[PDB]
Curated annotation (Swiss-Prot), chains A, C, E, G:
Highest taxon above the source species: Eukaryota
UniProt-recorded name of the protein: Insulin B chain
Gene label: INS
Organism, scientific name: Homo sapiens (Human)
Known outcome of mutating H10D: In HPRI; Providence
Whole-protein residues included: 25 to 54 of 110
Source lineage: Eukaryota, Metazoa, Chordata, Craniata, Vertebrata
Swiss-Prot record, chains B, D, F, H:
From-to range in the entire protein, with total length: 90 to 110 of 110
Protein name: Insulin A chain
Tree of life domain: Eukaryota
Disulfide bonds: C6-C11
Length: 30, 21, 30, 21, 30, 21, 30, 21
């Protein structure tokens, strides 16, 4: 995997690349 | 949530393969 | 004509900003 | 739908909150 | 994203003097 | 509880008082 | 280890590389 | 108290490990 400290459009967009057609939830909240 | 794991530290495919449906 | 795959990676833009702190839900199925 | 309107047509940043987390 | 690991030092740097006789109370978890 | 704001934002010799010992 | 007198700001910066993700405090009073 | 042990004289990584929560 591209192993990095991802943030911004660097992250959640990448899910849809791997997370598939199921869906996802975004918790910005630490 | 995800940030402590992935933005503060590096997250691998299957570490977030848990974040989806 | 209808590329959700692109709509999904573009919208995913507008999903994060508007809901960057409240976060968001998505299901690519739908 | 969400994948019907925002795609063949563009969406305004306000209605976008209809489908938020 | 922002690095507090670095960013904080400047800060953890500042807690001491400005604090004086009192000193500070930190927690590198939240 | 300050480390998340006083990082990307600016606080000096007057706002951080809130978190000092 | 490095061992010397440890006073002023120089010390407050020591518990940062030694204390970890746990947390800390600082008491200036000897 | 905290300083006299490490500042006046020398202090060691473990003698210092008690100054953490
Ligand atoms: Cl595109
Ligand atoms: Cl960046
Ligand atoms: Cl820096
Ligand atoms: Cl000196
Ligand atoms: Na982009
Ligand atoms: Na320095
Ligand atoms: Zn960037
Ligand atoms: Zn695009
Ligand atoms: Zn720095
Ligand atoms: Zn000096």
């Amino acid at each position: 995997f591209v192993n990095q400290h991802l943030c911004g459009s660097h992250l959640v967009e990448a899910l849809y690349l791997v997370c598939g057609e199921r869906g996802f939830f975004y918790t910005p909240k630490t | 949530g995800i940030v402590e794991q992935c933005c503060t530290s590096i997250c691998s495919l299957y570490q977030l393969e848990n974040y989806c449906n």
